[PDB]
């Protein structure tokens, strides 16, 4: 989405009163992409793709005329230089060898050479100029020259290595085989400049010829010569056509001095650059994927050559748009794709679109896709565990908005400093106008046609919006701009992040800055306890409870969502779930004797050992309901019987906690701790009697030597 | 194929072609009925300064929608006040984005 | 175990309201909460709790209902003002004798006016029976529009939304009031009907908010007719403009009348328009001298001659004194004639009907000649033949 220039090298050595000029015609790119080529009048230039500097000095004097085309051999080992000196040179190339480049085999036609092409498989050379076309095979070293009736301008070999396609400025497009026979001929009325063959693809596995005519059209032709009927029209005359690897994109340049990108169907996506002059040649960087390699591959690289003499490099980076509501995570894959992933089974569901997706928003069992001048909505069959998507409705209306959301029976679009409410039919319903740009919006649940929302502005004032009120309600004010906002489970507090990565917590009942934190990338609130706040910095994620020290993990990633005993961490474009131990907050709550909140925390799925510990603690501190709940959530029979005895004896007898502490300790295998606790206050005789029933009369005798019997 | 046909069937003119029928009427109407004013010694051109060009004033039987009508002259009032674009300009959206 | 629906069902079966409220809040299903507030007997703390929950949810109607059932009224006004629910606020203040609401509304309207949102201020005033201030605001907006290109049908659209929104709000209130009424309300409505039968013209004129809309429509129709021949219809339209004389200033109406009268050779109306134009309220000496020069030239080329026409019998009253076709004043009788929004001709025949959106008289012959599928003013998309039949039935009832 963002296009940034990388390095520019200018060639100002214009030579008046000389046929040698400063223009650049072609720019060959290596398959690996570690080296780059360019051709100027009477010279060739070798560049490094990553950094702009000549690895080798400019070669002059080899060809006494201009250089028309420079090409690789798909393997990075050969050079082909065609010149207006009626000659084509073929050079050997090798990076490690002391001579990096050196001429190998030179031949000459009868007239000037205009275009050249290579064979991806057999590495044969086809060079076409005025009045002649020649074929060169490395093994035989005997060229085959044939005459024609008009000068060929463009050539391109098919990716299968079997077919060949050439064009003439007289309007003739010829398709031949490796034997150079008239397999197919097509006659047009306009000159032919750019031709290409669609890359082979497991989904398509069929090759068609894409040719850009000068009557503002791009045509697709089959092998037999029958047109596919596309005949896509253009505003400008095309000049060059290049296909990206795997046949996903198409880089088109020409008139209006703009380099644009398209899908293989013909959908406009972006423009790359405007060079203020004709762009003679633009090329894309090939990519190599390993066996089962995992990578987003969002980065793209293009190389442009302008008519003034500038050879520029541009880098295109695709932004990430995703949505997460519950049990589903819908993120944009490689452009024109939406992937919905479930966090439990890691299963994926793919939805393929033809035009670029701009925003993805998912409501309850409803997914909204925002295509260029189109809106799609899909539902889910709730009864089946697996999700089935069916298109109930489609919106043809063209809407522009950097933020799009869907609520029950309504849609919300944020454009500039305005919020528009759209009916599902398409007609506009309501408008909201704010002072500055609306940066972040959050949707809170509610009744149909009555869903509220939070709005943050560039000024910083946080507002509330209701669907039917049509009157913004000022929530609060912030000096710095707002980047992201969140709301608590019970709508008690609100966490807001500024543009300086500063996190601030505001209480809604009393507008006061209770908590402030520096260098915060993301934050989230729990959906079950309403109090826990998990905020992730660039490297470390912290979880914080009410008036508690923070907890650190050294977890690599950014926090996106927080659920009951679950934290979602998103790295790059893939996200995972991490469980969090709740024993620390349990102990801290037990310290302050807050058994209700401690039990609520323990209810979040903690180990049974902590349940037993909490039950013991509640039983000791005379809280029988929580003790029964803890002793019941895990199937225990002796402890519940002892609890029943304790609750029966609490009303009448003294209920000395020493005896019950000793019994709790003795219910485990720690007999000596129980004996010490029982000897602590004064319960010698009952310790004696409880040790006797275990049939260890000797140790019980050792104990009864010290204890007395105060009866009579 | 059906999308284009249905859209052409309905085609609600939103903003762009609400009343675009602008053709010079200061000269078209002056040829219609001004001849006996110039023929006689009468100068009513001052009175005609009231009359608005008629080509802008459209005369066809269409359908008026309350919501649509609301949106249209809300956009008209916002334009004629001229407040949205000024605060958009001092918003410096391009500088940030 | 965080399974709220089953817990809610069990609580409902076991007759336990606090858990029911908690579960309904968690599932965000306040319809069960409406059932509960209908079910909770009277005057409990749960009333205040559920009112708080409703106010947080933004449904101030239920919040005010809960607050009034609890026994607190000030909190209901606080909810109404905080959520900008001004119709319910006005109703509650009027019924329960609260006075600061008018001041608070004035301050908020002034704040909106300072924020350059006059249309929102007009909406606010329309929400609280303050349509007069909205009318002045709309007149100011029209005057500001006139300073620029000012396509008149935009102003017609604006006045049409004003009237239609007033009608919609009044209809909503009316439907709320009639639904579930008693004997006293029936008697009040019977008295209202009795007064409606014997109504006065001035009261209808004040009530109808379509004044500016129909005035601008008549102006546009007069101009359009004048351009395409049909001078006699343009005369009647300009005479209607002169009749209104409220939104359109005197200059425009009298200039149009003078131009039409000159083009129709009817020089009495031209003379009246010219004597009107010589001094409206203020005029520079050069402009007045130019107008006098135009007048003297026009009236000294040839004397004012009245063209003959047909003096059709009057239908307003039983008087045998016929009235001129163009005249609508109906002097010495006081029975003014209703307009026809089709072409401007006064209703001189039994054939007249109207819609239930703008209630303007309309002649069958004009529709048949023009083939109008919609109402000329409000563009009501309902068939004219069935509407003629309905008006005939209504007249048969009368
Ligand atoms: Zn009469
Ligand atoms: Zn009507």
CB pairs under 8 A between B and C: 83
User: Which numbered ligand comes closest to the C-alpha of C327?
Assistant: 1
Question: A387: which DSSP letter?
Answer: -
CB contact under 8 A, A417 and B84: yes
| Residue C21 to residue C36: CA distance in whole angstroms | 8
* Four-point Cα dihedral C94, C96, C102, C105, nearest 10: -100
Closest-CA residue of chain A to B91: A436
Cβ neighbours of A323 (radius 10 Å): 20
Q: Does B87 touch chain C (CB under 8 A)?
A: no
Helix C152-178 to helix C211-227 angle (10° resolution) is 150
Contact A84, A129 (CB under 8 A): no
DSSP state of A212: E
Nearest residue, CB atoms, A469 vs list C28, C57, C83? C83
| Burial status of residue A199 (CB atoms within 10 A of its CB: 0-12, 13-18, 19 or more) | middle
Nearest Cα residue to A526 out of A643, A635, A642, A605: A605
Q: Which residue of A has its CA nearest to C60?
A: A469
CATH number, domain of A278, equals 2.130.10.10
The tokens for A264 are 């293989």
Q: Which residues of C are annotated as a binding site?
A: 314, 355, 358, 375, 378
Which residue matches tokens 């949106």? B71
> In the β-sheet with A268-274, what is the strand arrangement from edge to edge?
A238-243, A249-254, A258-263, A268-274
CB A458 within 8 A of CB A439: yes
C-alpha A34/C-alpha C24 separation (Å) is 64
Q: Does B58 reach chain C within 8 Å, measured CB to CB? A: yes
Q: C85 to chain A: nearest residue by CA?
A: A469
Taking the C-alpha atoms of residue A702 and residue A399, their distance in angstroms, rounded to an integer, is: 89
Probe site for chain B from C116, C138, C161 (most B CB atoms < 10 A): C161
- Ligand sitting nearest the alpha carbon of C328: 1
Whether residues A428 and B87 touch (CB distance < 8 A) is answered with no
Which residue of chain A has the CA closest to C117? A433
Partners of B68 on chain A (C-beta within 8 Å) are 427-428
Is residue A89 within 8 A of residue A62, CB to CB? The reply is: yes
- In the block, tokens 């009925």 appear at B33
> Dihedral (C-alpha) A458, A459, A464, A465: value to the nearest 10 degrees?
-50
Compute the half-sphere exposure of residue A606: CA atoms within 13 Å on the CB side of its CA: 21
Helix (H/G/I), strand (E/B), else coil: B65: coil
**CA angle (A469 as vertex; A468, A475 as ends), nearest 5:** 130
- Taking each continuous run of H as one helix and of E as one strand, the counts in chain C are 20, 0
Cα A95 from Cα A56, distance rounded (Å): 11
Instruction: Please indicate whether, in this complex, the C-beta atoms of C158 and B64 are within 8 angstroms of each other.
Output: no
Instruction: Give the C-alpha separation, C357 to C353, whole Å.
Output: 12
Neighboring chain B residues of C294 at a CB cutoff of 8 Å: 42-44, 46-47
Annotated binding site of C for Zn(2+): 314, 355, 358, 375, 378
* Cα C299 to middle of ligand 1, angstroms: 32
Q: How far apart are CA C305 and CA C299, in angstroms?
A: 10
Is A450's CB within 8 Å of C84's CB? no
Q: Are strands A462-465 and A473-476 parallel, antiparallel or unpaired?
A: antiparallel
List Cβ<8 Å contacts ≥24 apart for A655-664. Answer: A655/A622, A656/A681, A656/A683, A657/A620, A658/A683, A659/A683, A659/A686, A660/A619, A660/A620, A661/A620, A662/A687, A662/A690, A663/A690, A664/A616, A664/A619, A664/A620
Structure-block tokens of residue A499:
């543009």
d(CA A603, CA A612): 13
What CA–CA distance (Å, rounded) separates C87 from C129?
9
CA triple C92-C96-C100, angle to 5 deg: 75
CA–CA distance, C46 with C22 (Å, rounded to integer)? 11
Here the tokens at position A627 are 């003790």
Cα–Cα distance measured from residue A226 to residue A273, given in angstroms and rounded to the nearest whole number: 35
For residue C28, the chain A residues in CB contact (below 8 A) are 445-446
- Whether the Cβ atoms of residue A101 and residue A93 lie closer than 8 Å to each other: yes
Closest listed ligand to the CA of C329? 1
C-alpha separations of C284 from A708, B64, C278, C287 in Å: 127, 43, 11, 5
Which of B3, B65, B88 comes nearest A417 by C-beta? Answer: B88
Which chains have at least 3 CB atom pairs separated by less than 8 Å from chain C?
A, B
Tell how far the Cα of C74 is from the centroid of ligand 2, in angstroms: 44
Among A518, A514, A524, A564, which Cα is nearest to A538's? A518
How many A from CA of A429 to the centre of ligand 2? Answer: 24
Partner residue facing B50 (CB), from C144, C168, C252: C252
Cβ-Cβ contacts under 8 Å, B93 against chain A: 416, 437
Token code pair at residue C262: 């000159």
Instruction: Tell me the CA–centroid distance for residue C272 and ligand 1, in Å.
Output: 22
Query: For residue A207, which phi and psi values (nearest 5 degrees)?
Result: -105, 130
Q: How far is the CA of C362 from the centre of ligand 2 (A)?
A: 9
Can you tell me the distance from the alpha carbon of C79 to that of C63, in angstroms, rounded to the nearest whole number? 7
User: CB–CB of A437 and B91 under 8 A?
Assistant: yes
| DSSP assignment letter at A54 | B
DSSP string, A538-560: SS-EEEE-TT---EE----SEEE
Nearest ligand, measured from the Cα of C354: 2
Interface contact B84, partner A, CB < 8 A = yes
- Choose, out of A434, A445, A446, A528, the residue to mutate when testing the contact with C (most C CBs < 10 Å): A446
What Rg do the C-alpha atoms of chain B give, in angstroms? 21
CB atoms C57 and A469 under 8 Å: no
CB-nearest to A491 from C30, C56, C85 is C56
User: Which of A100, A148, A151 is CA-nearest to residue A129?
Assistant: A151
C85:A491 CB<8 A: no
Residue A662 and residue A672 in contact, taking contact as beta carbons nearer than 8 Å: no
- Compute the C-alpha angle C352/C354/C356, nearest 5°: 160
CB of A361 within 8 A of CB of A406?
yes
Spatial CA neighbour of B24 closest among B44, B1, B54, B69: B54
Token pair recorded at residue C337: 């004639």
Structural domain boundaries enclosing A261 = 2-317
Query: Is residue A163 a contact partner of residue A223, using CB atoms and an 8 Å limit?
Result: yes
CA atoms within 13 A on the CB side of C375: 23
CB distance C332 to C341 below 8 Å: no
Q: Which ligand is nearest to the CA of C381?
A: 2
Cβ-Cβ contacts under 8 Å, C256 against chain B: 50
Q: Compare CB distances from C59 to A450, A491, A528 and report the shortest one's residue.
A: A450
Q: Are A195 and A156 in contact (CB under 8 A)?
A: yes
| Closest-CA residue to C246 (of C283, C291, C199, C209) | C209
The C-alpha atoms of residue A363 and residue A350 are separated, in whole angstroms, by 18
Task: Tell which residue, A507, A501, A470, A467, has the closest CA to residue A487.
Answer: A507
d(CA A124, CA A178) in angstroms, rounded, equals: 10
Task: Enumerate the H helices of A199-320 as residue ranges.
Answer: none
CA torsion, ordered A592, A594, A598, A601, to nearest 10 deg: -100
**Max Cα-Cα span within chain A:** 137
Q: What is the resolution of this structure in A?
A: 3.6
Q: What residues form DSSP beta bridges with C227?
A: none
Who contacts C154 (Cβ-Cβ below 8 Å, separation ≥6)? B73, B76, C145
Which of A644, A646, A648, A665 is CA-nearest to residue A656?
Answer: A646
Binary contact (C301, B41; C-beta < 8 A): yes
Half-sphere exposure of residue B65, counting CA atoms within 13 Å on the CB side? 10
Paired with A249 in beta bridges are A263
Roughly what angle, to the nearest 10 degrees, separates helices A608-620 and A657-667? 160
Note the residue count of chain A. Answer: 712
Which chains does A contact via 3+ CB–CB distances below 8 A?
B, C
Nearest CA distance, C98 vs chain B (angstrom): 34
What does the alpha-carbon distance between residue C15 and residue A397 come to, in Å, rounded to a whole number?
A: 50
Rg (CA), chain C: 29
| Residue A340 in tokens | 């919905």
- For residue A407, the distance in angstroms to the closest alpha carbon of chain C comes to 14
**Does C3 lie at the interface with A, CB-CB under 8 angstroms?**
no
Instruction: Count how many residues are written for chain B.
Output: 97
Q: Which two tokens stand for residue B46?
A: 């001052």
Contact A311, A24 (CB under 8 A): yes
Cα C354 from Cα C362, distance rounded (Å): 6
Q: Where are the extended beta strands (E) located within C141-198?
A: none
If one counts every other C-beta atom within 10 angstroms of the C-beta of residue C351, the result is 16
Is the minimum CB–CB distance between C58 and chain A shorter than 8 Å? yes
Q: Which residues in chain B have their CB less than 8 angstroms from residue C257's CB?
A: none
Do C223 and B57 count as a contact with CB atoms less than 8 A apart? yes
Question: What's chain A's Rg over C-alpha atoms?
Answer: 38
Which among A123, A211, A208, A131 is positioned nearest to A166, based on CA atoms?
Answer: A211
Indicate which ligand has the atom closest to the C-alpha of C380: 2
Q: Which of A435, A445, A461, A466 to mutate to test the interface with C (most CBs of C within 10 A)?
A: A466
Residues forming beta bridges with residue A250, ordered by sequence position: A243, A262
Residue that the structure tokens 């010290």 belong to: A706
Q: Which two tokens stand for residue A421?
A: 């409410």
B79 token code pair: 């334009």
Contact A466 C58 (CB under 8 A): yes
Neighbour order of strands in the sheet with A566-571:
A558-563, A566-571, A574-578
CB atoms within 10 A of CB A656: 13
Distances (CA, A) of A69 to A23, A144, A509, B30: 13, 20, 73, 66
CB contact under 8 A, C58 and A471: no
Distance CA A112, CA A40 (A): 17
> Which residues are bridge partners to A54 per DSSP?
A47
Give dist(CA B54, CA C223) in Å, integer. 8
Cα–Cα distance measured from residue C217 to residue C244, given in angstroms and rounded to the nearest whole number: 12
Q: Quick one: how far is CA A182 from the chain centroid?
A: 48
Residues of C in contact with A444 (CB under 8 A): none
């Amino acid at each position: 989405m963002k296009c940034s220039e990388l390095w520019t090298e200018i060639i100002p050595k214009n030579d008046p009163n000389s046929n040698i000029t400063n223009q650049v015609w072609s720019c060959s790119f290596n398959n690996d992409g570690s080296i780059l080529l360019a051709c100027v009048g009477d010279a060739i230039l070798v560049y490094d793709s990553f950094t702009g500097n000549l690895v080798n000095k400019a070669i002059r004097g080899g060809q006494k005329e201009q250089i028309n085309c420079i090409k690789f051999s798909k393997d990075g080992k050969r050079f082909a230089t065609a010149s207006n000196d009626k000659t084509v040179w073929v050079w050997s190339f090798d990076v490690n060898k002391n001579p990096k480049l050196a001429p190998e085999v030179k031949y000459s036609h009868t007239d000037k050479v205009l275009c050249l092409a290579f064979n991806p498989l057999t590495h044969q050379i086809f060079s076409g100029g005025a009045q002649d076309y020649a074929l060169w095979t490395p093994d035989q070293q005997s060229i085959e020259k044939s005459k024609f009736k008009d000068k060929i301008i463009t050539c391109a070999w098919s990716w299968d290595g079997l077919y060949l396609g050439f064009g003439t400025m007289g309007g003739i497009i010829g398709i031949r085989n490796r034997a150079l026979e008239q397999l197919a001929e097509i006659q047009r009325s306009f000159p032919i400049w750019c031709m290409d063959w669609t890359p082979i693809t497991p989904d398509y596995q069929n090759s068609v010829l894409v040719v850009g005519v000068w009557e503002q059209s791009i045509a697709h032709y089959n092998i037999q010569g029958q047109q596919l009927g596309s005949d896509k029209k253009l505003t400008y005359d095309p000049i060059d056509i290049n296909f990206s690897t795997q046949g996903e994109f198409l880089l088109v340049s020409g008139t209006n001095n703009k380099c644009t990108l398209y899908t293989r169907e013909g959908g406009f996506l972006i423009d790359v650059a405007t060079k203020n002059d004709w762009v003679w040649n633009n090329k894309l960087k090939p990519v190599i994927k390993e066996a089962g390699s995992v990578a987003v591959q969002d980065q793209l690289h293009v190389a442009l050559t302008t008519n003034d003499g500038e050879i520029s490099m541009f880098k295109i980076q695709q932004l990430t748009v995703h949505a997460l509501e519950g049990d589903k995570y819908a993120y944009r894959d490689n452009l024109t794709d939406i992937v919905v992933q479930s966090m439990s089974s890691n299963q994926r569901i793919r939805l393929k679109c033809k035009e670029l997706v701009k925003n993805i928003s998912i409501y309850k069992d409803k997914l909204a896709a925002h295509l260029t001048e189109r809106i799609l909505i899909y539902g889910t069959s709730s009864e089946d565990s697996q999700m089935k998507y069916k298109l109930h409705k489609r919106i043809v209306k063209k809407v522009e908005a950097h933020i799009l959301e869907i609520v029950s029976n309504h849609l919300i679009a944020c454009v500039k400093n305005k919020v528009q409410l759209y009916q599902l039919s398409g007609d506009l319903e309501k408008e909201w106008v704010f002072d500055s740009r609306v940066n972040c919006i959050k949707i809170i649940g509610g009744m149909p046609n009555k869903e509220g929302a939070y709005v943050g502005l560039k000024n910083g004032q946080i507002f509330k919006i209701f669907v039917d009120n049509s009157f913004p309600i000022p929530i609060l004010n912030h000096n710095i701009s707002i980047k992201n906002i969140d709301a608590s489970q019970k709508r008690k507090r609100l966490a807001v992040v500024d543009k300086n990565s500063n996190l601030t917590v505001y209480d809604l009942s009393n507008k006061e800055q209770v908590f402030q934190e520096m260098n915060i990338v993301s934050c989230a609130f729990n959906n079950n306890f309403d109090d826990l706040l998990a905020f992730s910095s660039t490297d470390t994620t912290f979880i914080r409870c009410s008036n508690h020290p923070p907890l650190s993990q050294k977890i690599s990633g950014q926090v996106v969502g927080f659920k009951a005993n679950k934290l979602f961490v998103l790295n790059d474009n893939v996200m995972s779930t991490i469980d969090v131990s709740m024993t620390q907050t349990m102990i801290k709550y037990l310290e302050r004797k807050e058994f209700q909140s401690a039990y609520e925390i323990s209810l979040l799925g903690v180990t049974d050992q902590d349940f037993l510990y909490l039950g013991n603690e509640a039983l000791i501190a005379t809280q029988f309901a929580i003790a029964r709940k803890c002793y019941t959530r895990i199937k225990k029979l002796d402890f519940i019987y002892l609890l029943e005895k304790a609750e029966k004896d609490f009303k009448k007898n003294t209920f000395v906690e020493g005896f019950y502490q000793g019994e709790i300790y003795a219910l485990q295998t720690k007999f000596y701790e129980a004996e010490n606790a029982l000897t602590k206050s004064n319960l010698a005789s009952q310790a004696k009697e409880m040790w006797i029933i275990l049939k260890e009369f000797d140790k019980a005798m050792r104990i009864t030597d010290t204890g007395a019997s105060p009866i009579n | 194929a059906q999308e284009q046909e249905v859209s052409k069937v309905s085609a609600p003119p939103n903003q762009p072609t609400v009343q675009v029928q602008d053709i010079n009427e200061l000269q078209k109407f002056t040829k219609i009925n001004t001849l006996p004013q110039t023929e006689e010694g009468v100068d009513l051109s001052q009175l005609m300064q009231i009359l608005s060009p008629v080509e802008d004033i459209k005369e066809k039987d269409e359908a008026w929608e309350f919501l649509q009508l609301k949106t249209q002259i809300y956009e008209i009032v916002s334009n004629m006040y001229g407040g949205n674009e000024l605060i958009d300009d001092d918003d410096e959206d391009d500088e940030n984005q | 175990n965080f399974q709220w629906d089953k817990a809610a069902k069990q609580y409902a079966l076991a007759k336990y309201n606090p858990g029911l409220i908690e579960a309904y809040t968690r599932i965000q299903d306040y319809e069960g909460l409406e059932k509960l507030i209908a079910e909770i007997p009277e005057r409990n703390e749960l009333l205040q709790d559920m009112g708080d929950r409703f106010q947080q949810a933004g449904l101030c109607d239920a919040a005010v209902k809960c607050y009034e059932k609890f026994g607190d009224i000030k909190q209901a006004i606080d909810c109404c003002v905080l959520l900008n629910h001004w119709n319910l606020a006005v109703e509650l203040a009027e019924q329960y004798n609260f006075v600061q609401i008018e001041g608070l509304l004035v301050q908020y309207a002034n704040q909106l006016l300072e924020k350059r949102r006059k249309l929102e201020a007009a909406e606010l005033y329309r929400k609280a029976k303050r349509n007069t201030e909205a009318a002045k605001i709309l007149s100011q907006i029209a005057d500001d529009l006139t300073e620029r290109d000012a396509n008149p049908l935009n102003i017609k659209k604006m006045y049409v939304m004003a009237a239609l929104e007033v009608d919609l709000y009044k209809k909503r209130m009316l439907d709320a009031t009639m639904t579930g009424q008693a004997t006293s309300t029936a008697k009040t409505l019977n008295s209202l009907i009795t007064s409606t039968i014997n109504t006065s013209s001035a009261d209808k004129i004040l009530n109808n908010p379509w004044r500016g809309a129909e005035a601008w429509h008549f102006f546009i129709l007069a101009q359009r007719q004048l351009y395409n021949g049909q001078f006699k219809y343009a005369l009647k339209s300009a005479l209607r403009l002169g009749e209104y004389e409220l939104e359109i200033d005197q200059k425009k109406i009298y200039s149009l009348i003078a131009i039409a009268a000159y083009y129709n050779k009817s020089f009495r109306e031209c003379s009246r328009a010219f004597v009107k134009l010589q001094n409206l309220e203020n005029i520079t000496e050069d402009e007045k001298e130019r107008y006098e020069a135009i007048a003297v030239s026009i009236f000294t080329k040839h004397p004012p001659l009245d063209s003959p026409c047909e003096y059709t019998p009057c239908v307003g009253k039983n008087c045998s004194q016929q009235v001129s076709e163009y005249d609508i004043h109906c002097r010495a009788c006081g029975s003014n004639f209703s307009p026809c929004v089709a072409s401007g001709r006064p209703i001189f025949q039994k054939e007249f009907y109207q819609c239930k959106n703008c209630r303007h008289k309309m002649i069958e012959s004009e529709v048949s000649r023009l083939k109008l599928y919609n109402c000329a003013l409000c563009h009501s998309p309902i068939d004219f033949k069935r509407f003629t039949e309905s008006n005939n039935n209504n007249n048969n009832n009368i």
